[PDB]
Structures are given as structure tokens and as C-alpha cells.
Amino acid sequence: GSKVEDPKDFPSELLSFLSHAVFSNRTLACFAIYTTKEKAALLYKKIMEKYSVTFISRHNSYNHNILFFLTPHRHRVSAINNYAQKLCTFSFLICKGVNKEYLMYSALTRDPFSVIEESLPGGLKEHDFNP
Amino acid sequence: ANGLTVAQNQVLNLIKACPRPEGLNFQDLKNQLKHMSVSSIKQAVDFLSNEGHIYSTVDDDHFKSTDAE
Structure with a gap:
């Protein structure tokens, strides 16, 4: 358009590593939040001490910030979505x-x-998963 | 719905239905399911990990779960 184009989905460069669905009735651990740097900054400290994430990192994409975190505690995908959407x-x-x-x-x-x-x-390693 | 094998179904269930705070170690999996070979258990564990049902808490042998309903 004429200003910053705000998307409603993740970039094609990461869509290949995403489950796409969020209302999927299954357990998950790795979750990514595409938001503003200010918002991702808050979630960075909040989610960390909320779900005791094994790994959390703020990454720069194109026009926004992507918060990548992995929750050790097994839970449904939609469970995290409701919290983030709130x-x-x-x-x-x-x-x-x-x-x-x-x-x-x-x-x-x-x-x-x-x-x-x-x-x-140094990012994620084999100690966060199972060989 | 149940996109898992009957054999794996039991393996996962044994871990989540274990009365141990440590969950169920790899050495415990073969202990309970003696008919389960190490090679088979390792594959199941990997699959259950990809299914996001189990995870290495503080060791690759120290398996633990949370959601498997």
C-alpha cells in the first residue's frame, strides 16, 4: 500500500516449518508469536515464567518481531492461543x-x-529434545 | 483420530499413567514392557516426541509427559 503492510499470517520462509492450524486438538511444545517488538518483549518475560519455557528467543523478521519459545509442559495448541489472543x-x-x-x-x-x-x-540443541 | 499404533498407544499410556514423579525412564519402559525391544522403544519414544506427548525432562532416559488425553 503506502505504509507498513501488516500481515495476518507467518512468512513463506517459516510456513514450511509450521503446523498452520492453531485449533488442532493435539499436544505441542514449540510455539511462535508473530507480533510487535514491544509485545514480544512482554511475552518474553511473561511466558518464560508462566510455562517455564526451556527456550525463548526474540527474532527479527521483516516488518515485525517473532517470539519463538518451547514449552516443556505438554498442552494443547489452542490452550496457548487463547492466552496470546487475550x-x-x-x-x-x-x-x-x-x-x-x-x-x-x-x-x-x-x-x-x-x-x-x-x-x-546458542539456540536450541539436542538436550532440549530426544535423540 | 488415534493416529498411533496399538503398541505405541500402550507405551505412551504407561508413561502418563505411571505413579512415579520421575515419570518413566527408558530403563523402566523395557522393565514394564519386557516384550518391547530397545530398538522398538527408541522408535516409539521418537514418535511420541514428535507427537509432542513425551519429552526429555532432564535426561534422554528420563521421560515425562503432561498432555495425552
Whole structure:
């Protein structure tokens, strides 16, 4: 248009590692929140001490910020969506289930997708999953 | 609906229905299900991990669950 184009979904560069559906009646761990840097900053500290995420990181995409976190406690996808959707009083929110954690992080660490802050010392590893 | 094998269904159930706070270790899986070979259990664990039902709490052998309803 003439200003910042606000999308309603994730970029094609990450859609390949996403489950797409959020109302999927299944358990998940990896969740990504496409929002504003200010919003992702709040969720960064809130979700961390709310679900005791094993890993949380704020990444820069194109026009917004992507909060990538992995919850150890198993729960339904929609359970997280309801919580995130609730905090959309000052900014939008695109939270969807991640199909491939390590794979998504791999894309979130290349050229356009920059790494701002993260809890783990060097992204995700084999210690967060099961070989 | 149940996109899992009957064999794996029991494996996952044994872990989530375990009265142990540690959940169910790999050494415990083969202990309970003696008819389950290590090779088979490892595959099931990997699948259950991809299914997001189980996870390595503080070790690859230390399996734990939360949601499997």
C-alpha cells in the first residue's frame, strides 16, 4: 500500500516449518508469536515464567518481531492461543503451532531473520529434545 | 483420530499413567514392557516426541509427559 503492510499470517520462509492450524486438538511444545517488538518483549518475560519455557528467543523478521519459545509442559495448541489472543488489546497477534522447532530456528537465523535475544547459549540443541 | 499404533498407544499410556514423579525412564519402559525391544522403544519414544506427548525432562532416559488425553 503506502505504509507498513501488516500481515495476518507467518512468512513463506517459516510456513514450511509450521503446523498452520492453531485449533488442532493435539499436544505441542514449540510455539511462535508473530507480533510487535514491544509485545514480544512482554511475552518474553511473561511466558518464560508462566510455562517455564526451556527456550525463548526474540527474532527479527521483516516488518515485525517473532517470539519463538518451547514449552516443556505438554498442552494443547489452542490452550496457548487463547492466552496470546487475550493480550491483543494494543497490538495484533499471530501465534501458531511450530511443526519443526530446530528447522524453524535454522530459518530464523539467516539473512532477514536476525537474532536479538535468547535464553539458551546458542539456540536450541539436542538436550532440549530426544535423540 | 488415534493416529498411533496399538503398541505405541500402550507405551505412551504407561508413561502418563505411571505413579512415579520421575515419570518413566527408558530403563523402566523395557522393565514394564519386557516384550518391547530397545530398538522398538527408541522408535516409539521418537514418535511420541514428535507427537509432542513425551519429552526429555532432564535426561534422554528420563521421560515425562503432561498432555495425552
